[PDB]
Amino acid sequence: SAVMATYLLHDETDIRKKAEGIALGLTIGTWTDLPALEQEQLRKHKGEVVAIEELGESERVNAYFGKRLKRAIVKIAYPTVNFSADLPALLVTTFGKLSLDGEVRLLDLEFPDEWKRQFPGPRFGIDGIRDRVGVHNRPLLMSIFKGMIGRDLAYLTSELKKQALGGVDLVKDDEILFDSELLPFEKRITEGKAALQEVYEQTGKRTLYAVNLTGKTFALKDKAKRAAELGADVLLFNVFAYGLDVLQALREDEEIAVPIMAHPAFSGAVTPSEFYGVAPSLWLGKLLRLAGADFVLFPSPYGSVALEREQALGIARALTDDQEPFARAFPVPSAGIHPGLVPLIIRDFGLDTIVNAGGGIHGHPDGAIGGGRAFRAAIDAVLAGRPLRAAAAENEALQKAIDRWGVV
Amino acid sequence: SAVMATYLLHDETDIRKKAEGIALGLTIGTWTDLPALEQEQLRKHKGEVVAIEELGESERVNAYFGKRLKRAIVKIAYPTVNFSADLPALLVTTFGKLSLDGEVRLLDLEFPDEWKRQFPGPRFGIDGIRDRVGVHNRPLLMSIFKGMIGRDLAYLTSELKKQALGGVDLVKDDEILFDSELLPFEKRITEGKAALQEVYEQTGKRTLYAVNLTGKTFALKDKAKRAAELGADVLLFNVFAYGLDVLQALREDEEIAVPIMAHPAFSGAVTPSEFYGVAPSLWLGKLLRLAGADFVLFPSPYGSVALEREQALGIARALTDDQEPFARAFPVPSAGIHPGLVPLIIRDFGLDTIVNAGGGIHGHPDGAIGGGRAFRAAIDAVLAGRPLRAAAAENEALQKAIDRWGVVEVEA
């Protein structure tokens, strides 16, 4: 039983030597200087290099570093009996001191099934979320509150109702919206709930509200429990500013049991480099799903703020792979999304994804209501196999959206 | 009142345009379309670009990216009224969505004094730690347990004694030593304490034990409190695997009040890039001190695993700057350290530093006892105004260390 870590290494020195040094140094330390009884005692704790795939040198990389760097994908096995069954221990064991060892980038982690079972996965997942939103035959649609910093509850409820009237399935606080005297956490929840209930009585559709869960770590469970009691729909959480273990703690608390939406804020401090950090499929995908996120937002491959296509697809794959012993998490490609991108979003991510937009909603000529209607029309058109311009002939909101941002 | 963030940007599009976009987009979002009444009401929340220092375009960077990238240092002011007084809010506000915006690297964060005061800083700091171990003037000496994974308490106590008999001031668990049936957290503390007092009884040397504080986040305060009750000397903490806010929580809990040693594990996932992440001086220095670390271990600028000299010095400066409303944190340059490096360590970091012999101390020809003796002899030599080799001629432990690893020249 061992967790196998896969790394990308760049080095001017022997990579196999370094890999072997890591496997031994980061597990039992030394081996050949150990007495007979001690070797049989520590054998189960000895790390091992599982494989080394040589990639050959890159002129571009060499030029950048001004040196000749050998490249390779290295796989190392760390016995699970070497650490406690928790994410902080996993990270320290597989990329603690090693993260400081020059050019080393963590690409993936693979675990025995028995080990994975010590973790929760999403509480609701795609199926649970669809049941709660009441939408099963199409991708979901979400809008983001914009310009709320410094505004009051009257403004919040007004803005919340407009987005809901646009037909969005969910509305989330912007991740930079923190608790204040004007907008207290509990008041956002209770007043938002009432406002959405009024819209529900007018349309028959109840839009869900993902409220930002912020503040100090040791106060999170208490307010999350209050959120559950007050009837909050979803908890938005900037997990990377805390720790993966905190997300897991929120997921495992039976007194919370509210869907959790993980935001990518600060994940960019770890994922972009070619030589360092942790790959996004693992950092935003595999680990967040395992830790308990029901939704995971990540930069789409389309906007100004984006991810390479295969990187984004890799995250979605990790979130939905049904071979994992966890519920599937909702992939939410984000940033700069507008109606004209709906055809591509569905083509790339399928039906089990969420169309998420802030400016794409509020920037519509007719406000949030028009913005939401344009998106709903675009989604229906794609599912029906109709070009957006054809569908726009029968939907003014979509026409205005297409005229403003175009079709991709 | 605003927090000023300093960023390094690489971009093929207008940097000033992007800067203004960040100041506005990450604060109030819109401004020009707001009526006079709303502007005056939201003015206090409006972010602003403070300065933009244009740097020379780099041929090396351009070749790497295969494009022409303009470079600049951008400073943005974020009103403190926009976010709550906690580190997670600070990070999300100054480098949340922005960390995803292409080539942007956070270099520094400047806080108004009034804001800093809502944070603890180290509980003990350099002065407090020196009093706890009873060592003034000279740099401290610390060693790390070797190969403890899979071992039992009898092995731990025997190994702990060897290190203390070598004269080290502090011994720390390896950061990858997690709790187990063989080595329970509380037992390491109590058995370790007994072993160290026995050593004091025979040699007169006082040695502290930094025990690894691990496990799930919400069980940390309970065990730290227990550690305090049991008299633990220092709590070693892999802060970067937990979040800066957790370190602050441990520091602010009056029922703990035990020195905290922050380990750099995982910080390398954030600090090394030339275009992304967060600079070491901020991530390992300024923020850890503010959060409550009494000691901060970081890659020294000497070994295989290291940091550029100015980078390492920058961390030490942030940890010890007397201009901050916080106690100074002990800088502990680590990795590759050996007796032959003591002169350079003291020349570079001064007397208020800790020589971290790490696990290498066990590699001395005569084991940890000889290894510690070699280090203590080297420290005394420098303080006595003598070359290591002069002292080596009178100290066999030091001579063996020099013969084994050599002496690093300090002459400029």
Ligand SMILES: CCCC(=O)/C(O)=C/OP(=O)(O)O
């Ligand atoms: C990748 C997450 C982006 C985000 O947090 C946000 O609020 C986006 O807004 P729009 O780009 O849709 O206007």
Ligand SMILES: [Mg+2]
């Ligand atoms: Mg946002």
Ligand SMILES: [Mg+2]
């Ligand atoms: Mg270690």
